[PDB]
C-alpha atoms as one frame of an Amber mdcrd trajectory, in Angstrom:
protein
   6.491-203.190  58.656   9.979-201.700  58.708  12.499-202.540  61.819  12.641
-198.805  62.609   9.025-198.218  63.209   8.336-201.511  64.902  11.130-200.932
  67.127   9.542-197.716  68.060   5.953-198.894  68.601   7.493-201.298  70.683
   8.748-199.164  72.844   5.693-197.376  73.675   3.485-200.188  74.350   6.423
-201.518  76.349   8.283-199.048  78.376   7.207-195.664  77.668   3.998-194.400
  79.522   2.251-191.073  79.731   2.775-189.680  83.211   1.509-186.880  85.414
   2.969-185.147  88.443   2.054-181.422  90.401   4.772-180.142  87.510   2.568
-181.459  84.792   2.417-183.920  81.781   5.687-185.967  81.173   7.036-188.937
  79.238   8.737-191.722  81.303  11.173-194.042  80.380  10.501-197.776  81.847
  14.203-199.453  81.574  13.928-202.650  83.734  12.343-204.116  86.172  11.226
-201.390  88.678  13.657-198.698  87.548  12.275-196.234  85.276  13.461-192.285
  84.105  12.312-188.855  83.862  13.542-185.887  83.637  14.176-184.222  86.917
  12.469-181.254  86.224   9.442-183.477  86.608   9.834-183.364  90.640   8.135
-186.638  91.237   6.791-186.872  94.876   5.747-190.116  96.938   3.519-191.037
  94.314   3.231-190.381  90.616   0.320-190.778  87.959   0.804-193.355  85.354
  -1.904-193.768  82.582  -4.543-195.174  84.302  -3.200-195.542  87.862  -2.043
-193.604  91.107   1.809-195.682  91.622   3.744-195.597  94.624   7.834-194.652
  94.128   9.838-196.204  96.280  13.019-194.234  96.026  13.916-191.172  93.411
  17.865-190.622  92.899  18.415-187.158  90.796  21.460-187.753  89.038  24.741
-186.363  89.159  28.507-185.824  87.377  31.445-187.099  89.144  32.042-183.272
  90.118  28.632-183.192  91.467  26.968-181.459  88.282  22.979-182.260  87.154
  22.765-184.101  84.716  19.031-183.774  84.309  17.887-187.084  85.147  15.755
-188.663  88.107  15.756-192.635  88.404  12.527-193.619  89.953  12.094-196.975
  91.754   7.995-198.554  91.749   6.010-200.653  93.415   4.531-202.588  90.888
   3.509-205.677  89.964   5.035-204.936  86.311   8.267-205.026  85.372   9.355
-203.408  82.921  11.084-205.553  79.245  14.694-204.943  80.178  15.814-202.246
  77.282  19.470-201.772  79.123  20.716-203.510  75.871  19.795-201.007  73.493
  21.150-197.812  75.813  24.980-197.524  74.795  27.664-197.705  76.760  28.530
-194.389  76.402  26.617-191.229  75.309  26.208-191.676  71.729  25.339-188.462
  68.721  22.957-189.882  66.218  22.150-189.269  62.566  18.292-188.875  61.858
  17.131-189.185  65.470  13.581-190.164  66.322  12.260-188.034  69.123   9.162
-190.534  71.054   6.586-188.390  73.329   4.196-190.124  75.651   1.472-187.759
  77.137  -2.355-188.132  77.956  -1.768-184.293  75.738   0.233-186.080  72.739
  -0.070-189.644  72.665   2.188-191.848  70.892   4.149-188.792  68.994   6.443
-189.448  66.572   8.843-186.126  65.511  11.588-186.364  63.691  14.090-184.349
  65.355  17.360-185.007  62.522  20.750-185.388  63.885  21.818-185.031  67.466
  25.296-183.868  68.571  27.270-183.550  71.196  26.734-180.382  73.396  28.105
-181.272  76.488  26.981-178.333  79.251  23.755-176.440  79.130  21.786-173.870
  80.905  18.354-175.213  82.379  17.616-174.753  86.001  19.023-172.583  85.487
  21.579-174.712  87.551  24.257-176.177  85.761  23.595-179.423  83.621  26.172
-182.154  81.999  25.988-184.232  79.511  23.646-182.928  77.207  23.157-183.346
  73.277  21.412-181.456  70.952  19.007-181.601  67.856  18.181-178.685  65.317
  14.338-178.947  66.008  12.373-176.707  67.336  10.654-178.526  70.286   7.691
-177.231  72.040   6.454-177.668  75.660   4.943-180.562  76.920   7.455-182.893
  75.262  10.085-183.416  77.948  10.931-186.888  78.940  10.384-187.885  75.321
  12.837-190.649  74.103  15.488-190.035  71.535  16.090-193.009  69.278  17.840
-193.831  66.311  18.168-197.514  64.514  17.621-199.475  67.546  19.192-197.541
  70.059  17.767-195.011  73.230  20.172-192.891  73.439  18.660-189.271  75.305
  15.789-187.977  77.179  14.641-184.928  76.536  15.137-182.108  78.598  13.915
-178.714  77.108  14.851-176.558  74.133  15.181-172.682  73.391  12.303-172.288
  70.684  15.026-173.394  68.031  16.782-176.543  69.669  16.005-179.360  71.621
  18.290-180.456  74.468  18.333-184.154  76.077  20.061-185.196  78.857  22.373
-188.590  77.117  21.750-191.413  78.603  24.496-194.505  79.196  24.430-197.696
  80.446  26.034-197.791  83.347  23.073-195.130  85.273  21.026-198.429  84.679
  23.045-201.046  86.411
């Protein structure tokens, strides 16, 4: 088995669980330890569905620019008895495009989805509240409902979340290191 597919099925039996909440169906990113990420259109309240399991959060911080813009993103704290493989390594430093992206949904609707999304470039701001929302980066793929919080991935590397798309595109919200720390 190839390093790109292993590296992918790795990452849904390890930190990427199908999730529910009153909004609906979502993907969520496990990075490490406790911490985990969704996409703040999500909403999580006090509590959130995961797989098999009614979880208590902790603490929820939506995400923000240094000029106070969304940028799409809600870290969740749990109280668990798992912790989560620390993946902080393979998020870069900085938002990083990709050639030949992997988009990775996780959904009691879609289970263990692989779609291959292409390339993703940098968009920077994007319509989605609609409020205002930074950071963003974008893949020629026509992406349906039901697939935000999916993880973009290319060779190794978690670089986006997904967000939404417009029927043609697919938006994510980047993701960096440091939001992790």
């Amino acid at each position: 088995m190839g390093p790109s597919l292993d590296f992918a099925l790795s990452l849904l039996r390890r930190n990427v669980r199908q999730v529910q909440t009153d909004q609906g169906h979502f993907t969520m990113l496990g990075v490490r330890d406790r911490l985990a990420v969704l996409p703040r259109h999500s909403q999580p309240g006090k509590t959130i569905w995961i797989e098999h399991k009614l979880v208590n959060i902790l603490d929820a911080v939506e995400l923000v620019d240094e000029q106070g813009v969304n940028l799409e993103l809600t870290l969740i704290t749990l109280d668990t008895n798992e912790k989560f493989r620390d993946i902080t390594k393979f998020i870069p430093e900085n938002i990083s495009t990709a050639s030949d992206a992997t988009l990775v949904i996780n959904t009691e609707h879609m289970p263990s989805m692989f779609v291959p999304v292409g390339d993703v470039v940098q968009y920077g701001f994007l319509n989605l509240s609609g409020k205002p929302t930074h950071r963003t980066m974008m893949y020629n793929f026509p992406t349906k409902a039901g697939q935000c919080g999916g993880v973009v991935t290319s060779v190794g590397k978690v670089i986006g979340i997904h967000i939404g798309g417009n029927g043609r595109q697919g938006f994510c919200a980047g993701l960096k290191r440091s939001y992790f720390a």
